[PDB]
Each structure stands twice: as C-alpha cells, then as structure tokens.
C-alpha cells in the first residue's frame, strides 16, 4: 500500500536536530521524500512508502528528537508519485 504523506510540523522545531531525526528514521523505514525548514518557523515533510512505514514515521514526528517541542502535526495521505530516490533534508 505505497501512499504519499504530507506533515507540517509546528513547535519548536528548527535548530532540535528535526530534518536529521526525520531523515534518519526514514532512511531507517524506507522512505523516500524530504523534511524541509520553511521561513514561519515550522517544518514540513513530504514522504512516499508502505503506509506501515509512513505511519511509524509520523509516530516519530509527532514526538519529535529529544530537543524538539512539538504543538500540533498536521497530516494528509494521497496518491504515491514514486517522485523520490532518496530521503533529504533543506
């Protein structure tokens, strides 16, 4: 069941060590796509996979790395593109 998975982040979130947690356990999961700092502060993620995979992801992004302070997850599922070939971090 590949799907695509879009999450926007809010919190404090940028200078925790984020998009390398995020990166780190998609590479761990098999998931391609990219965790990438936007200009508001927050961080958005978009990453394709098995829909096991993105929702063991989407556990860890919820949580965050130990320095992150995570308020709110928004997330949305939609058709895999098969767009990625690899998992990176802007």
């Known amino acids: ?49 098995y829909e096991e995979a993105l929702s063991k992801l989407l556990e860890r992004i919820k949580q965050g790395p130990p320095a992150a302070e995570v308020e709110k997850v928004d997330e949305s599922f939609s058709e895999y593109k098969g767009e990625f070939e690899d998992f990176e971090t802007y």
């Open 1 to 49: 069941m590949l799907k695509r998975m879009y999450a926007r982040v809010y919190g404090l979130v940028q200078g925790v060590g984020f998009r390398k947690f995020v990166q780190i356990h998609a590479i761990r999961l098999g998931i391609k796509g990219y965790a990438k700092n936007l200009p508001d502060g927050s961080v958005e993620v978009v990453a394709e996979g």
